[PDB]
Design an enzyme around this catalytic site. Structure first.
Site: not given
Ligand SMILES: Ic1ccc(Nc2ncnc3[nH]ncc23)cc1
Ligand code: NI
Length: 316
Positions: A240, A259
């Protein structure tokens, strides 16, 4: 004494870039869990730090207004050509998002509906180091709490740039600073918890085992799958986090972070279930399968399409 600028207050110090809102909406990008270094200090005016300088960003319908604070007690002036290029590269405005949106929409009806409201969601081109350690702090966390952790980490370990109102800005620390013998204990004091160990340990790993931040630049030109595997050797960095760094820092547009959030989106909005894998719920194998699904569907900029949905899913 010095305070946050606005377009009304001191318009002499601002400079514009031609940018429709089909290409960029600040409010859908700067706080969509990509960067954690931007805050809307005054309405429609986003302040944050970029490469050991502070910027304030606002926009109209077809213009992106920007102003710089250098901080070293020099003559205040408009952004230079080179500083504007840095900002152009940061938003990756060379890449047409309008054409990407239409391309993704042709093979995805769900994206078509979401694309109506949520235009101008694009991927930032972030510093690798900053991205790496920020996303180590992201495990079992939330954007609000992550933003606090990163802020405190920069104040304790990073160099001071300038103060605006009651906000003091710091640049992101170098690897050496986070690799010291007292770094973990201090980071726990700042409230990172178990993540403090991974921050310190990954700092030491990159220095000792990989030979400093030049390594992260090598991964930038290496293939996605090579870069991903290399990141997963670091403490606290799994698939991730590795995919996030690939997508957001190492110029791998096909990287699709999986995630709990995108697993939810995939299931609810696309009706996807793991076919090749036997297990019903999440797993390393099933998460990888879902990433492959979205690459197959969207193509080589699948990670950019993912960010549109991720950003849209944050807004209820
Ligand atoms: I807690 C947390 C904080 C930030 C994220 N950011 C991301 N995760 C997956 N894909 C994404 N695309 N743009 C942001 C992004 C995820 C979980
Ligand atoms: Ni189902």
């Amino acid at each position: 004494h010095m305070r946050h600028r606005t377009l009304s207050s001191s318009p002499a110090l601002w400079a514009s870039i031609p940018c429709p809102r089909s290409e960029l909406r600040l409010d859908l990008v700067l706080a969509s869990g990509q960067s954690f270094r931007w805050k809307e200090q005054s309405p429609a005016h986003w302040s944050g730090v970029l490469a050991d300088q502070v910027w304030t960003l606002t926009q109209t319908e077809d213009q992106l207004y920007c102003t710089v604070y250098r901080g070293d007690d020099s003559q205040v002036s408009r952004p230079t050509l080179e500083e504007l290029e840095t900002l152009h590269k940061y938003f990756q405005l060379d890449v047409s998002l309008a054409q990407l949106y239409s391309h993704w929409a042709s093979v995805d009806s769900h994206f078509q509906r979401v694309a109506q409201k949520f235009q101008g969601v694009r991927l930032l081109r972030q510093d690798p180091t900053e991205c790496l350690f920020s996303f180590i702090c992201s495990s079992n966390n939330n954007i609000a709490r992550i933003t606090g952790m990163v802020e405190r980490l920069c104040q304790a370990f990073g160099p001071r740039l300038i103060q605006l109102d009651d906000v003091t800005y710091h640049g992101f620390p170098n690897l050496h600073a986070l690799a010291g013998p007292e770094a973990e204990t201090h980071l726990r004091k700042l409230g990172l918890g178990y993540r403090a160990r991974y921050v310190r340990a990954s700092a030491k790993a990159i220095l000792e085992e990989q030979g400093g931040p030049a390594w992260l630049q090598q991964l930038r030109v290496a293939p996605y799958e090579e870069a991903h595997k290399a990141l997963c050797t670091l403490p606290g960095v799994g698939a991730k986090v590795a995919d996030c760094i690939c997508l957001m820092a190492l110029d791998k547009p096909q990287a699709v972070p999986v995630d709990v959030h995108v697993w939810q989106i995939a299931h609810r909005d696309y009706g996807w279930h793991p076919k090749t894998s036997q297990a019903k719920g999440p797993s390393p194998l099933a998460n990888k399968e879902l990433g492959n699904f979205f690459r197959n569907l969207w193509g080589p900029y699948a990670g950019w399409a993912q960010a549109v949905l991720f950003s849209a899913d944050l807004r209820q």
